[model samples]
Target: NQFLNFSLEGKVALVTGASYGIGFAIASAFAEQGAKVCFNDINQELVDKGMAAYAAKGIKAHGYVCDVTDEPAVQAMVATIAKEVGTIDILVNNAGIIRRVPMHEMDAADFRRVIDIDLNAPFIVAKAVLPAMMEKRAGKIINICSMMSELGRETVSAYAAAKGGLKMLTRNICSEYGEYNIQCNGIGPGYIATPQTAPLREHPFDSFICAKTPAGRWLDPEELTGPAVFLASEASNAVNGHILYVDGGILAYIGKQP
Candidate 1:
């Protein structure tokens, strides 16, 4: 029972783009631990699909579809949830993309798309939720960053820019809002085993990661839930603007030389 108090117990949480994979699992944990789970994704079809999956798990999740990159739409979505579910106490910025296109090929249009959703979208959503949180003088803001925030490799120019920028955004939010007791932080997950990575596994260049990782395996999306839950709950009150890497020590190691 000592730890059961981490139970959010009716706190309202809005998790963006949580239809499945990492987002779904994180949102689901919040709901199960007693946060009122609200989520958004790309379209009504994806929203509905996500709802059904939660229903199978016997959780009633409020689902919505809004382009997080659009501040107007996000404003409306936040107001809608605030009206129905009450002021959002927890927010997780889980909407992001990593394009594998080469940098020379990283045209302005593609670069904008990645920046809009990955970096700018969090700004929009966080701005939307902040008024309520600020007036209340309490909130939790967590952004889904990337391993790219710290380490860079090829074929990720746009993503590196977005996620890397997102890290500083998280810090700035803390700098600006920590006075009100609102904590802003980030979670950086390594290669997660999800439908998103199914094709990689199917092709089997995947084991390339196995030999390189100390864990010798891809991590499950559910592995992210604990970090999410702690951040959203009271136990993490003093922690702010820190990016926790759930990478199974990938960063701590230099891969064995060939």
Candidate 2:
């Protein structure tokens, strides 16, 4: 009975941008394992919607509206979370934005906006929770990285740049905080299939992704939940600064040749 692990009993979790989809899946899994679930969105409307969604699933999730890119707002939100729920034992930086435009066509403002949301926000959110984690000398930080963190494609210059930068930020946080027993890691998802992604599936992009992926199908949001839970749980105590790519072997396979 002394070898217990992976149970999130009595822990508190905060997953940003979890109004729906992958973030919701990860947070829900944590709650199922007995953690207090907290989530955030960019606006009050989305936060309310998230509350309703979670309620429908019978999950008692605390919802808040805080722009992850806003440092003061995030700091306030984190404090509020600690007061209402508890100090965050698990933090998942899942809020991000992406713009698909060619490098020449993408304006500098567009590029900066992507960087601010996708890259800078994670740093801000992590910074807010880190002091508490460090004080406790224990925490788990999971960054929702992407396939773009490793590969490059046309019309996604800014997204690629921000994701690539986040990859290193994951490592840097791990490097700086490992001594405090804070394990920071990343989850690199493949092309996720969801209702919002119907367009991609209904178009040529679906075929293209299947062709590239060894699984020959799109990845479900729940597919990432196990790894997310693992990284958030005690199972990954020493697993720091690594991007666990759930890409269906896309990063490993070359491709079918003529």
Candidate 3:
């Protein structure tokens, strides 16, 4: 039982952009394990939706409206979270955007947008929370990276670049903060079956992904909960700067015979 140090009781966890999809699943898991869950979105509508989703599951989650890409807004939100829910013991940078544009066709502005949200925002939010964590000598920072961090695909140039940068940032944060007991890690998810990907899961694409994955299917959003919980809790105290890929063996496999 001592090896199962996964309990998050009496902890305050802040998951950004958790209105739905994988973020929602991770937040729900933390709540189920007794952590005080808090989350944020870019607008009131999404925040309301997140609150309702948590309510439907009988979980009391604090939802806020704040754009994670805005440094000033993120700083203000972190301060408010500390005053309202206690200093953040766990932070999940789950807010991100992807533009499926070819490298040559991608505009600089579009590329910057993806990097700002997926990479820069995590740095800003982590900066805001690091002081407290350094003072207390304890904290967890989990960035929701993607398979793009390791593999490159067509029409996802911007996303892949941003995720690659984020992977390095995760390690850098660990190098800088490990001495303070602040663990900075990342989660690389495979093709997950979420509403956002519903359209893509339709014909040749669905079969293509299934064939590439050893699991032979698209992953459910809930499949990421266990890794999220493990990295967020004391169970991963000695694990820092590691990107735990919950890709159902996609990365490990060479794909079916062509």
Candidate 4:
């Protein structure tokens, strides 16, 4: 079968913010490829709901209701997973929050909230997972960055900065962990149609995104699954500290329709 070829049969993967959207898609993709998935989200209801969906398919997936913003909670969760399920062979740092506020009108607290959830939480979760990876001397770490990780967008100054910072943070982690045979990298997705971005897919917003993207349409959530599996599998073993963009040529066109 096609699935058997790309399987992660003996690997365990932890995906943060996995209750919904891209995170959920990534977790489901990993499970489909035969990896045991451990996922977390701040919302208990969503986590329970997502895990139920996975369980229905007889997939090996665990849901942990924990806030990624809390470093100690993340640490404990990873430790428990390591003890119970074996070392996390692959980690997907997908936990993040976004707030749309114009730079001039944004409150300091709002900025901090975005930064804490996006940038800071990745650091905390990665730190929590790093020990087990190092112990094994081999692992894969995938950080979910944003299209804004490379470019800027209006009314999202904090989100842009955080994603940009995450890009470099991925590189730094890879540099430090490479000696231990660990590979770290980041994924930058363009406007993907997900629950988190449903509002943008409505009417005028949808047209605007379509006109801005060269592909002339928003990307499907499923389109990202292959890249996620590639990063987690041996397919991308030598691709370390790289930021892979899955945008429909958004960066190549300079926001114009030729």
**Number of clashing residue pairs in every model?**
0, 0, 0, 0
TM-score of 1: 0.95
lDDT score of residue 105 within candidate 3: 91
CA lDDT, every model vs. true structure: 0.90, 0.92, 0.92, 0.87
Candidate 4 local lDDT, 31-139, one digit each (tens): 8888989998777898888888778767768888899898888888888888888788988989888888799999999999999998988888888888878988889
Q: In angstroms, give how far residue 28 of model 4 lies from its true place.
A: 0.9
Residue 101 of model 4 has an lDDT of 79
Q: Would you give me the overall lDDT of model 2?
A: 0.92
Please provide the root mean square deviation of candidate 2 (C-alpha atoms, Å). 1.4
TM-score of each model, paired residue for residue: 0.95, 0.96, 0.96, 0.92
lDDT of 2 by residue, 93-194 (tens): 999888989999899999999999999999999999999999999999999999999989999999999999999999999999999999999999998898
The weakest ten consecutive residues by lDDT in model 3 span 1-10
Per-residue lDDT, model 2, residue 240, is 96
lDDT of 2 at 101: 91
**Candidate 3: tens digits of C-alpha lDDT, residues 1-258:** 635789999889999889998889999999998899999998899999899989999998999899988889999898998999899999999988978878899899999999999899999999999999999999999999999999898999889989999999999999999999999999999888888778887678888898989999999989999999999988889999999999989999988886
Per-residue lDDT for 247 in model 1?
84
lDDT of 1 at 243: 95
Order candidates by lDDT, high to low.
2, 3, 1, 4
